[PDB]
Amino acid sequence: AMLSFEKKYRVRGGTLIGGDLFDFWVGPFYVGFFGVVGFCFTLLGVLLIVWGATIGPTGPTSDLQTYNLWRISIAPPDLSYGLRMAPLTEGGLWQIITICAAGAFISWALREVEICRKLGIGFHVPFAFSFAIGAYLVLVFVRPLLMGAWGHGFPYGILSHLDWVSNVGYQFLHFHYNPAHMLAISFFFTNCLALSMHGSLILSVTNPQKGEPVKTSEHENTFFRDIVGYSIGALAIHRLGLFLALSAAFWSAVCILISGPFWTRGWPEWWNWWLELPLW
Amino acid sequence: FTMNANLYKIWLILDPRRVLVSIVAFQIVLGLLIHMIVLSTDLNWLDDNIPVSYQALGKK
Amino acid sequence: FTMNANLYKIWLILDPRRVLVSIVAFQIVLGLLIHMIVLSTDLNWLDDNIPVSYQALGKK
Amino acid sequence: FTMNANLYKIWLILDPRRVLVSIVAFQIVLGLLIHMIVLSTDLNWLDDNIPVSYQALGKK
Amino acid sequence: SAGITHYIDAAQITIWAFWLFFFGLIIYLRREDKREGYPLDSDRTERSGGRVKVVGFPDLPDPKTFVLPHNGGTVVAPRVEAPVAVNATPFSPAPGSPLVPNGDPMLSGFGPAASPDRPKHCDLTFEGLPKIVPMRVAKEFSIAEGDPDPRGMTVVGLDGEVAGTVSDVWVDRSEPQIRYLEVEVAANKKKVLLPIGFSRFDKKARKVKVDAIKAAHFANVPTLSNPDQVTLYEEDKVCAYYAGGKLYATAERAGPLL
Amino acid sequence: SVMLLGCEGPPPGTEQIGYRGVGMENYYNKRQRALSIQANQPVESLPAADSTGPKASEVYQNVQVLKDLSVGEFTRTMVAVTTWVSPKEGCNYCHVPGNWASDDIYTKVVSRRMFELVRAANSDWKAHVAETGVTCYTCHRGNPVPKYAWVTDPGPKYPSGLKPTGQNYGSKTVAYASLPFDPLTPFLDQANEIRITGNAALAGSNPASLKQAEWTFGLMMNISDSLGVGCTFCHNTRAFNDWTQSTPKRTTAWYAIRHVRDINQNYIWPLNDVLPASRKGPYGDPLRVSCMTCHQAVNKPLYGAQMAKDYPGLYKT
Amino acid sequence: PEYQNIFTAVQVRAPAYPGVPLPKGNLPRIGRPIFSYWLGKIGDAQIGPIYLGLTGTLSIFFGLVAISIIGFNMLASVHWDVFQFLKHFFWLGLEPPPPQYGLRIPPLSEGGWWLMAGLFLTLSILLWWVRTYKRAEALGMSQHLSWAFAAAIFFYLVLGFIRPVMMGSWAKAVPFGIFPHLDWTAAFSIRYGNLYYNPFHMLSIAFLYGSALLFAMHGATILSVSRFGGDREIDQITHRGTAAERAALFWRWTMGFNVTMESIHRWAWWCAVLTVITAGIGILLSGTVVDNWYLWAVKHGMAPAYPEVVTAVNPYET
Amino acid sequence: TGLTDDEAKEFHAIFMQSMYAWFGLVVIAHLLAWLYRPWL
Ligand code: BCL
Ligand code: BCL
Ligand code: BCL
Ligand code: BCL
Ligand SMILES: CC[C@H]1c2cc3[nH]c4c(c3C)C(=O)[C@H](C(=O)OC)c4c3nc(cc4[nH]c(cc(n2)[C@@H]1C)c(C(C)=O)c4C)[C@@H](C)[C@@H]3CCC(=O)OC/C=C(\C)CCC[C@H](C)CCC[C@H](C)CCCC(C)C
Ligand SMILES: CC[C@H]1c2cc3[nH]c4c(c3C)C(=O)[C@H](C(=O)OC)c4c3nc(cc4[nH]c(cc(n2)[C@@H]1C)c(C(C)=O)c4C)[C@@H](C)[C@@H]3CCC(=O)OC/C=C(\C)CCC[C@H](C)CCC[C@H](C)CCCC(C)C
Ligand SMILES: CC(C)=CCC/C(C)=C/CC/C(C)=C\CC/C(C)=C\CC/C(C)=C/CC/C(C)=C/CC/C(C)=C/CC/C(C)=C/CC1=C(C)C(=O)c2ccccc2C1=O
Ligand SMILES: COC1=C(OC)C(=O)C(C/C=C(\C)CC/C=C(\C)CC/C=C(\C)CC/C=C(\C)CC/C=C(\C)CC/C=C(\C)CC/C=C(\C)CCC=C(C)C)=C(C)C1=O
Ligand SMILES: COC(C)(C)C/C=C/C(C)=C/C=C/C(C)=C/C=C/C(C)=C/C=C\C=C(C)\C=C\C=C(C)\C=C\C=C(C)\C=C\CC(C)(C)OC
Ligand code: HEM
Ligand code: HEM
Ligand SMILES: [Fe+3]
Ligand SMILES: [Sr+2]
Ligand SMILES: [Sr+2]
Ligand SMILES: [Sr+2]
Ligand SMILES: [Sr+2]
Ligand SMILES: [Sr+2]
Ligand SMILES: [Sr+2]
């Protein structure tokens, strides 16, 4: 099924790969060659997370085995295995599910790409998506590699991965002092601010007080100029928000990339370079 | 004087208003900068109790 | 006076208003700065309780 | 030296409203700051325990 | 007995309240989501002659009216929109198959070249003067000190060939900026709009590249019913044409790569 | 710049601490690990002494601690205490020349007390000191004054009008963090409460303040830094208070904390009247002990070198 | 190749805009505009004018007072050494009244500046609130911002005033300092048994992540349909264009459903307000209702169990 | 600076007098400070 204005755009071609082979739609989703690779990667990934849930860390009958959603968890192999493939039931499974996750996100990104080629729009979205794909890769590929073992990756479990974050965070004592962490956190917070401001605006002008007509560009600029003496303007606000969120993802990726591989000490200690300048 | 030759032509290349404003800024910064450096090392001239102690001139 | 004659010409190169307001800015800043500096040192005139111990004429 | 035979001309160069508001702000600020500084040193005039005890006895 | 630990704490029930408010929120947002494009297009609808208008869950929200300022109109959502034929034919008769554009792809007005029928009126300033107008109509505007003046650059298409030259610059009277480049076309000296989004500058050369279409295609740029202003209808019409070239302007953008 | 800044290269040395996926792991600089090892080299022992002879308390005049030693063994014990505590100065550091039995010089009233300090340590604190035990070098390192001794410090200046933040400053003593900069006096001298975690999910029976939590956090930063490790060395940060999820090092550290309370309270504060101003902080409190004092940034002083077992004169009875 | 609409490559100027006109009662506007070729490189180059009423003046006033107490206090903690102030600034801070005082108004030297700075800050934030509602009325617009600011104000109030009053202790509000307030955050999680297991803090985290997800997606979209003037979202909302069409379709073909130029702004709006609102609820139950979230998670069976491969004997139990 | 050749001599002269006067008050203040409490 299609939107009431969709058929007129549902053109043939634009692929990267597959050509007419998989050049079709299913419901509202576009398939494409990468939808197929993606679905395959995805399906095997999920079906394996289901098998991991099925078997548990000590076998299907042990008490640690579980199907409870908060607690099902698939973890990496020990560090003793380094960059080698580890036995299936010892984190191998986790490795394969990871390969599937990376492949699925990359297929998804490439399929959004074929969709830009079809619709004839800019490719800003899948490029932006690729930042999340990047962050995910540092958290499973880059860091654990630079760290000589795949086990440095986070486990795939709703709260257990939260625990990973917690103890990794705490090896540096007071993570808040990670300066890249400070950045990324600043962007994540500001991004959340501009978004609330844009959101609020569009909705405040296209739906004004009863007795008033859809508002104008002139209003838009005049309100935020009224409040804070400046208005970045309509186009650009869409530009900024994209900057903030992509950067927030960036600095998360770098703040974790340096926590290990390039810094081992507590993070507050990093700030020493500042108390020791020859100014004080 | 000069550097030699024709160091006037330099102002056909570099904005005189900007070189002036920039230098004024820089000299002001370097000044506070160094003052702050020397006071921060052994060469301090304020916290010495020289030539007469001041906080235990308000003690006895 | 040890200066130029063509020294007024500087006001054909640099906007006078800015320089005037600026001097005040910089001087006020320096003034506050140095004041706080002295106050942080041996030359302090406030933290000692003299000539009538206002913090221990009816306290302590 | 006191005053120029032409230091009125400063208001041909500087806006009376901005200079006025500026002065007001700076002085009000300075009043506050200095008050805070005095309030943070010996010369405190509030917690002296003089001229008559207001916390009768002890606790408070 | 002073220890009967209750299994229910405020934290459970606050998580309960939250999820309930959540579900209602999600549902609601999906309703504002069907103020356009709905009901959907299936052959479920056509087979049944229409007795299956496709709307899904949740359903469609009662229309809302937008009261345009300036004797402009009134818009409603969701609305009933007149169907419009597709200027293309099914690549396969099976459903979900894409369609091939009819005729010359850039002309088709199908695919990356498709576009809707927006009003044949102009967007307006607050005052009510044509928001987008040329610098020739908007006297005040001026290049920003230190920016090559586009006026007089050479517009050049995707293959290299000169396309035309910048005859003017259209600007937003509401949010001051370059929206459209005007192009005196070489092959016929007719004046066409070129969206800024399709234009790249080469300031050191004073060229204005355009990957969209070929120099030649500039001949078919959709036209304006008045050279001193433009309507909403005409903007979509202008841009979609260039956009078509992204998939059409060459016998290779069609993809594959392998 | 806005320089950039503070940085090590990859790959770091790593050790897995907890279960795979739990994140309880450790990272470290290999280079600096090697430098710490060369700086944490132990002094080899002096040949055992045969002896075979009378007890020290029978041939000497003022032997109140190293009594039960044979003469030979006593002499050996004297040579180890000499190189270990004050080798640039030799024998004369703690003795009045020509008179080995005299206590007419303070460094001896102290040395004596420290003979009871090491002994109590090696014989009573094994749940802490295990079979590595301690010796003079542990704190002294060829120095008369442990380099890494501490003092209750007053922090930076405050005018008279306001009282100190108690926390909020740049201090290497709380790992550079801003927590409170003297988490030692209330925990490694006195015995204030460290526990703040509740043992019940719901509230109404845990009075721990947030402030107390910060003090515990500061102290912990201290500890971490002194032994040169992170919390996953002793904890499972999902539960700092959970003993079953902790590492056997938390147990060890627990007994160590009590131990430093005993060194500081019954061996060091008492020596304050016979010690010179040169050995005292701004409150008149004397230089005392912390974990750093001994560990000097390593999980086991001198990488767990076994020095004491070679000097029997260092054990009680 | 194709312009990305990241950097305005060629700008244009026009006489500045004093703005749509306000009704009687809404005071004059002040300041007269300027342009920054560089803001201009990326956005509206116009800088100001600004509006300042009774509200705006009372808010700037309170706010700057509050900024002074915090600052002056920080200079005092380093002995008026502006150098040292500069050196440790990040670590400087103004701590809260001690518990010994409870909710009593404390002496200057023991926390009273914090209560005054907290007081004045709050009054100034809430005055800025009123400001945005006035500035939003003068334009006939709606209070969507004010409903969000009111939400963020909600979190603020929960953090430094509401939870403290409920807990009967000013020492529980957050201290003013960069590193000090970071430490307050960590200690907060620690004191209540790891905040990761607090459901509300998990939701607030899903919503913060979501503000980044939605704004990145939408923002990337609007740029990708910038070519069709999709940035001109108002008219794409009244009079749907091929920008809003290609936009809704990119996502439709990608994730199976989609929204509209008007509705995405609601998903985004609602997602941001939600962050702060789960967030505040999250701090509200800590100490008031739950004292140890990890335990709470165990009581509701949500905390995972791992084989106990490392363990330590409890001295308190010997 | 859109100034004429004469309105920078006038300006410059007045600037010079006001500024040296400033330095004068400055030396006054500095000698009073030196008398009440020598610092060098
Ligand atoms: C534990 C205590 C330490 C700490 C330890 C850490 C550690 C350790 C880390 C962070 C990380 C981050 N922390 Mg932290 N952090 C601390 C406290 C905080 C605080 C706060 C108020 O106190 C905040 C705001 C943050 C916030 C942040 C961000 C700066 C960052 C996470 C964003 C990210 O990863 O993007 C990345 C986004 C992604 C990777 C998602 C990618 C999406 C992929 C491609 C697709 C997913 C598809 C999937 C299938 C979707 C499901 C859909 C189904 C199909 C339906 N932390 C505490 C003090 N923090 C993490 C980080 O840096 O990021 C790398 C990190 O490693
Ligand atoms: C640390 C050891 C000594 C010390 C050794 C030195 C040394 C050595 C030097 C100083 C210098 C100076 N010291 Mg010292 N100084 C000491 C203690 C102090 C104390 C104090 C509280 O005790 C103070 C307040 C000062 C302060 C001063 C300043 C008066 C002066 C720096 C001027 C500058 O930076 O360049 C500002 C730049 C200019 C004025 C350039 C003039 C610009 C021209 C006119 C540009 C033309 C354009 C237009 C006409 C005007 C430009 C715009 C201007 C903004 C007006 N010193 C300590 C005790 N000090 C410097 C000096 O020279 O002093 C004579 C210097 O070299
Ligand atoms: C330290 C380790 C703890 C931690 C402890 C906390 C605590 C404690 C809190 C958070 C809070 C939150 N945490 Mg956390 N957090 C952890 C790790 C993380 C991680 C991660 C990847 O690990 C993430 C993503 C997060 C994410 C977040 C955000 C989702 C959330 C707050 C949103 C926000 O900005 O509110 C901030 C926005 C505001 C406060 C409103 C701002 C508006 C005000 C009024 C602005 C006024 C401006 C002012 C007047 C301007 C003048 C300046 C003056 C000088 C002051 N945390 C770990 C588990 N986290 C909140 C929470 O969850 O509580 C349940 C919170 O308070
Ligand atoms: C450190 C130990 C001594 C000390 C020793 C000194 C010494 C030594 C000096 C001062 C000086 C200053 N001291 Mg003191 N001072 C002490 C204690 C104090 C205390 C106090 C609460 O106890 C106070 C309030 C002051 C206050 C002052 C300032 C009034 C003055 C510097 C003026 C300035 O910065 O302007 C900066 C200047 C300007 C901004 C421009 C000057 C005005 C121009 C010429 C006007 C032109 C018109 C203009 C265009 C428009 C004007 C409007 C502007 C908005 C202003 N001192 C302690 C006790 N003090 C200085 C002084 O006396 O004057 C030289 C000085 O040299
Ligand atoms: C980079 C800046 C921000 C961003 C941007 C971003 N994300 C994006 C996009 C963009 C622009 C898309 O266009 C794309 C999308 O489709 O939009 C929703 C996407 C996306 N954002 C999503 C996730 C996501 N993005 C996140 C964050 C971010 N993305 C940043 C905030 C986050 C977090 C952690 O906050 C998440 C969870 C997806 C819904 C979607 C991409 C969906 C997709 O790629 O699907 C294909 C894959 C599957 C359907 C699953 C594969 C099967 C696997 C083998 C099993 C899962 C393995 C997994 C590793 C286990 C982890 C378990 C966890 C419980 C720990
Ligand atoms: C969805 C929740 C998000 C959110 C929303 C949000 N924030 C908001 C709003 C909203 C809806 C507003 O309406 C309001 C705003 O104005 O938006 C731009 C605001 C706000 N967001 C801001 C901060 C903020 N919000 C944050 C977080 C968040 N807010 C969440 C991400 C954060 C964080 C945690 O990172 C911060 C730091 C502020 C800019 C603003 C509230 C401003 C305010 O309350 O002002 C109080 C007082 C002052 C600023 C004092 C004035 C000081 C002047 C700046 C100096 C000017 C002096 C001048 C020279 C005059 C002369 C002086 C004389 C006295 C001498
Ligand atoms: C055996 C075998 C064959 C298996 C059977 C297969 C099975 C199981 C069949 C089931 C099929 C069904 C039920 C579903 C398929 C599941 C698929 C493949 C997975 C879904 C993956 C997917 C990405 C889901 C994510 C869901 C969420 C919430 C994503 C977050 C994004 C977000 C918050 C969503 C809502 C907001 C959206 C969509 C905004 C997009 C959007 C934006 C951003 C604009 O800016 C814009 C501007 C102008 C007009 C329109 C838009 C617009 O639509
Ligand atoms: C109708 O639309 C609307 C408007 O138009 C009328 C408005 O005007 C408005 C009003 C909006 C405003 C007035 C906007 C105000 C902006 C705010 C509050 C955001 C605050 C941001 C800052 C203060 C800037 C912080 C950042 C910096 C100072 C620069 C930092 C530089 C750094 C970190 C180094 C650069 C390098 C990196 C970051 C690494 C690499 C970067 C990436 C990978 C990111 C990629 C980005 C892109 C864009 C492709 C609204 C709400 C609106 O909706
Ligand atoms: C030298 O410097 C000069 C310019 C003088 C000034 C410089 C000033 C500077 C640089 C100041 C810097 C300040 C900084 C960096 C501050 C940082 C603050 C941060 C990061 C704070 C973070 C969190 C703080 C919070 C959440 C505080 C919350 C406090 C609240 C909500 C207090 C509420 C109190 C109220 C409402 C009081 C009520 C009083 C009543 C009426 C109840 O009394 C009876
Ligand atoms: C090689 C150098 C040294 C020699 C030859 C030496 C020799 C002796 C002798 C012979 C005695 C017994 C004296 C008596 O009580 O009659 C003695 C006692 C003692 N010496 Fe040493 N000594 C040396 C170095 C040191 C050093 C360096 C210290 C302290 C760091 C020290 C601390 C003591 C103490 C405290 C006593 C009293 C012992 C007790 O009560 O058990 N000696 N020394
Ligand atoms: C920097 C991160 C660290 C944090 C946040 C931290 C936090 C804590 C907290 C909160 C407690 C109290 C739990 C309760 O309230 O019942 C605690 C207790 C304890 N921690 Fe730490 N810790 C850290 C590092 C360390 C390290 C490295 C060690 C050992 C070398 C250690 C050893 C201990 C011991 C033995 C206890 C129990 C002490 C007692 O109960 O008297 N901690 N820690
Ligand atoms: Fe938008
Ligand atoms: Sr089972
Ligand atoms: Sr130094
Ligand atoms: Sr004095
Ligand atoms: Sr007094
Ligand atoms: Sr009273
Ligand atoms: Sr480490």
From TrEMBL, chain A:
Binding locations of bacteriochlorophyll a 1: F175, H176, H181, C255
Residue sites binding ubiquinone-8 3 per the record: H198, S231, I232, G233
Residues annotated to bind Fe(3+): H198, H238
Binding residues for ubiquinone-8 1: H198, S231, I232, G233
Domain of life: Bacteria
Keywords, in A-Z order: Bacteriochlorophyll, Chlorophyll, Chromophore, Electron transport, Iron, Magnesium, Membrane, Metal-binding, Photosynthesis, Reaction center, Transmembrane, Transmembrane helix, Transport
Positions contributing to bacteriochlorophyll a 4 binding: H176, H181, C255
Subcellular location: Endomembrane system
Cellular component terms per the entry's GO annotation: endomembrane system; plasma membrane light-harvesting complex
Annotated positions binding bacteriochlorophyll a 2: H161
Molecular function GO terms recorded: bacteriochlorophyll binding; metal ion binding
Binding site for bacteriochlorophyll a 3: H176, H181, C255
Pfam annotation, one family: Photo_RC
Membrane-spanning parts: 29-53, 92-110, 122-142, 182-205, 240-263
Binding site for bacteriochlorophyll a 5: H176, C255
Membrane topology: Multi-pass membrane protein
GO biological process: photosynthetic electron transport in photosystem II
Binding site residues for ubiquinone-8 2: H198, S231, I232, G233
Function in brief: The reaction center is a membrane-bound complex that mediates the initial photochemical event in the electron transfer process of photosynthesis.
NCBIfam families for this protein: pufL
UniProt record similarity statement: Belongs to the reaction center PufL/M/PsbA/D family.
The name this protein goes by in its record: Reaction center protein L chain
Automatic annotation (TrEMBL), chains B, C, D:
Membrane topology, record value: Single-pass type II membrane protein
Residues that bind bacteriochlorophyll a 6: H35, W45
UniProt keyword terms in alphabetical order: Antenna complex, Bacteriochlorophyll, Calcium, Cell membrane, Chlorophyll, Chromophore, Light-harvesting polypeptide, Magnesium, Membrane, Metal-binding, Transmembrane, Transmembrane helix
Stretches that traverse the bilayer: 19-38
Predominant location: membrane
Coiled-coil regions listed in the entry: none
Entries under PROSITE patterns matching the protein: ANTENNA_COMP_ALPHA
Every Antenna complex alpha/beta subunit domain range: 8-46
GO cellular component: organelle inner membrane; plasma membrane; plasma membrane light-harvesting complex
InterPro entries noted in UniProt: Antenna_a/b, Antenna_alpha, Antenna_alpha_CS, Light-harvesting_complex
Cellular compartment(s): Cell membrane
Residues given in the record as Ca(2+) binding sites: W45, D48, N49, I50
One example of a Gene Ontology biological process annotation: photosynthesis, light reaction
Residue positions binding bacteriochlorophyll a 1: H35, W45
MF terms in GO: bacteriochlorophyll binding; metal ion binding
Binding site for bacteriochlorophyll a 2: Q27
Domain of life: Bacteria
Residues noted as binding bacteriochlorophyll a 3 in the record, renumbered to the chain: Q27, H35
Known role: Antenna complexes are light-harvesting systems, which transfer the excitation energy to the reaction centers.
Family annotation (NCBIfam families): pufA_517_ASD
Protein name: LH1 alpha polypeptide
Source organism of this protein record: Thermochromatium tepidum
Taxonomic lineage of the native organism: Bacteria, Pseudomonadati, Pseudomonadota, Gammaproteobacteria, Chromatiales
From TrEMBL, chain E:
Protein keywords: Membrane, Transmembrane, Transmembrane helix
SUPFAM superfamilies: Photosystem II reaction centre subunit H, transmembrane region, PRC-barrel domain
Transmembrane segments: 11-29
GO cellular component terms listed in the entry, alphabetical order: plasma membrane light-harvesting complex
InterPro entries (alphabetical): Bac_photo_RC_H_C, Photo_RC_H, Photo_RC_H_N, Photo_RC_H_N_sf, PRC-brl_dom, PRC_barrel-like_sf
Domain named PRC-barrel: residues: 147-215
Residues annotated as domain Photosynthetic reaction centre H subunit N-terminal: 4-137
Gene3D superfamilies: Photosynthetic Reaction Center, subunit H, domain 2, Photosynthetic reaction centre, H subunit, N-terminal domain
GO BP term, pick one: photosynthesis, light reaction
Protein name, entry field: Photosynthetic reaction center H subunit
Organism field: Thermochromatium tepidum (Chromatium tepidum)
From TrEMBL, chain G:
GO terms, biological process: photosynthetic electron transport in photosystem II
Residues given in the record as bacteriochlorophyll a 3 binding sites: H181
Annotated positions binding bacteriochlorophyll a 1: Y196, H201
Sample GO molecular function, one term: bacteriochlorophyll binding
Amino-acid positions noted as binding Fe(3+) in the UniProt annotation, renumbered to this chain: H218, E233, H265
Subcellular location(s) of the protein: Cellular chromatophore membrane; Endomembrane system
Binding, Ca(2+): E95
Listed transmembrane segments: 50-76, 113-133, 145-166, 200-223, 267-290
Topology of this chain in the membrane: Multi-pass membrane protein
Residues annotated for bacteriochlorophyll a 4 binding in this entry: Y196, H201
Stored Pfam families: Photo_RC
Binding site for bacteriopheophytin a: W128
GO terms under cellular component: endomembrane system; plasma membrane light-harvesting complex; plasma membrane-derived chromatophore membrane
UniProt keyword terms in alphabetical order: Bacteriochlorophyll, Calcium, Chlorophyll, Chromophore, Electron transport, Iron, Magnesium, Membrane, Metal-binding, Photosynthesis, Reaction center, Transmembrane, Transmembrane helix, Transport
Binding-site positions, bacteriochlorophyll a 2: Y196, H201
Function according to Swiss-Prot or TrEMBL: The reaction center is a membrane-bound complex that mediates the initial photochemical event in the electron transfer process of photosynthesis.
Quaternary data: Reaction center is composed of four bacteriochlorophylls, two bacteriopheophytins, two ubiquinones, one iron, and highly hydrophobic polypeptide chains.
Protein family according to the UniProt entry: Belongs to the reaction center PufL/M/PsbA/D family.
Protein name stated in the entry: Reaction center protein M chain
Gene responsible for this protein: pufM
